[PDB]
Write a protein that binds this ligand. Structure first.
Ligand SMILES: [Zn+2]
Length: 44
């Protein structure tokens, strides 16, 4: 009875490694590591 194993991957901060439940949560948290938005040759 294979469930499916399609996806449904959790949302974790690739910066620290903290998993979250909501999408806005993780993101609103990532801002802590990443300052302004990625413009270009400025940040990276
Ligand atoms: Zn983080």
């Amino acid at each position: 009875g294979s469930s499916g194993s399609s996806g449904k991957k959790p949302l974790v901060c690739n910066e620290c490694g903290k998993t979250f439940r909501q999408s806005s949560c993780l993101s609103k948290h990532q801002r802590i590591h990443s300052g302004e938005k990625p413009s270009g040759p400025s940040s990276g």
